[PDB]
Write an enzyme that holds these catalytic residues in place. Structure first.
Site, PDB file in Angstrom:
ATOM      1  N   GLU A  35      11.964  -4.711  -4.164  1.00  0.00           N
ATOM      2  CA  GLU A  35      10.858  -4.816  -3.168  1.00  0.00           C
ATOM      3  C   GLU A  35      10.923  -3.591  -2.245  1.00  0.00           C
ATOM      4  O   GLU A  35       9.865  -2.995  -1.972  1.00  0.00           O
ATOM      5  CB  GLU A  35      10.948  -6.131  -2.416  1.00  0.00           C
ATOM      6  N   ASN A  46      -1.735  -3.378   0.822  1.00  0.00           N
ATOM      7  CA  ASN A  46      -2.349  -3.998  -0.385  1.00  0.00           C
ATOM      8  C   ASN A  46      -3.854  -3.712  -0.404  1.00  0.00           C
ATOM      9  O   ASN A  46      -4.435  -3.404   0.647  1.00  0.00           O
ATOM     10  CB  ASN A  46      -2.037  -5.495  -0.405  1.00  0.00           C
ATOM     11  N   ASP A  48      -6.271  -5.705  -0.573  1.00  0.00           N
ATOM     12  CA  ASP A  48      -7.013  -6.693   0.249  1.00  0.00           C
ATOM     13  C   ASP A  48      -6.923  -6.345   1.741  1.00  0.00           C
ATOM     14  O   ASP A  48      -7.532  -7.067   2.525  1.00  0.00           O
ATOM     15  CB  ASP A  48      -6.541  -8.108  -0.074  1.00  0.00           C
ATOM     16  N   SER A  50      -4.097  -6.428   3.553  1.00  0.00           N
ATOM     17  CA  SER A  50      -2.849  -6.995   4.084  1.00  0.00           C
ATOM     18  C   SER A  50      -1.755  -5.925   3.897  1.00  0.00           C
ATOM     19  O   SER A  50      -1.963  -4.979   3.159  1.00  0.00           O
ATOM     20  CB  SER A  50      -2.511  -8.298   3.411  1.00  0.00           C
ATOM     21  N   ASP A  52       2.667  -5.492   3.448  1.00  0.00           N
ATOM     22  CA  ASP A  52       3.998  -6.069   3.182  1.00  0.00           C
ATOM     23  C   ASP A  52       5.053  -5.315   4.017  1.00  0.00           C
ATOM     24  O   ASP A  52       4.987  -4.082   4.085  1.00  0.00           O
ATOM     25  CB  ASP A  52       4.329  -5.926   1.699  1.00  0.00           C
ATOM     26  N   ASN A  59       4.347 -10.599   3.469  1.00  0.00           N
ATOM     27  CA  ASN A  59       2.930 -10.212   3.491  1.00  0.00           C
ATOM     28  C   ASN A  59       2.252 -10.760   4.757  1.00  0.00           C
ATOM     29  O   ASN A  59       2.495 -11.921   5.101  1.00  0.00           O
ATOM     30  CB  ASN A  59       2.257 -10.702   2.214  1.00  0.00           C
TER      31      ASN A  59
END
Ligand SMILES: [Cl-]
Ligand SMILES: [Cl-]
Ligand SMILES: [Cl-]
Ligand SMILES: [Cl-]
Ligand SMILES: [Cl-]
Ligand SMILES: [Cl-]
Ligand SMILES: [Cl-]
Ligand code: NA
Length: 129
Positions: A35, A46, A48, A50, A52, A59
């Protein structure tokens, strides 16, 4: 902070992640490696809108507030910047909520694709725990 493999294993063990909901410590170390490359400051945006955050790439759509993810939840009740701390406590406490949510560690796309069904014990081999 960029953690060593064994240093992180020890920190996660002290915060109660070894066998949390049946996931051996090696699973959590493997997820963190893929990750974030063990870097508490990792961020990734991301498609969309959002973002992380941190060592486990939590998220902003569901788990933390970053002030720029419209119609998002804050289920861990923390600012997303708290997840970038060298103290992994906020990340660990939020990860325990996530893994209790029904999908287990499948919530972490890198765990599903790169850790699941592999010899995860290899991630803690050699560590003094
Ligand atoms: Cl490594
Ligand atoms: Cl393990
Ligand atoms: Cl927001
Ligand atoms: Cl919320
Ligand atoms: Cl908050
Ligand atoms: Cl820590
Ligand atoms: Cl599970
Ligand atoms: Na949010």
């Amino acid at each position: 902070k960029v953690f060593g493999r064994c240093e992180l294993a020890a920190a996660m063990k002290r915060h109660g992640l070894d066998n949390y909901r049946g996931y051996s410590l090696g699973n959590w170390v493997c997820a963190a490696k893929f990750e974030s490359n063990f870097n508490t400051q990792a961020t990734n945006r991301n498609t969309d809108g959002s973002t992380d955050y941190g060592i486990l790439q939590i998220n902003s759509r569901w788990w933390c507030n970053d002030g720029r993810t419209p119609g998002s939840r804050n289920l861990c009740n923390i600012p997303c910047s708290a997840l970038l701390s060298s103290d992994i406590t906020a990340s660990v406490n939020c990860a325990k909520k996530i893994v209790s949510d029904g999908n287990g560690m499948n919530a972490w796309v890198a765990w599903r694709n790169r850790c699941k069904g592999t010899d995860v014990q290899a991630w803690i081999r050699g560590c003094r725990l």
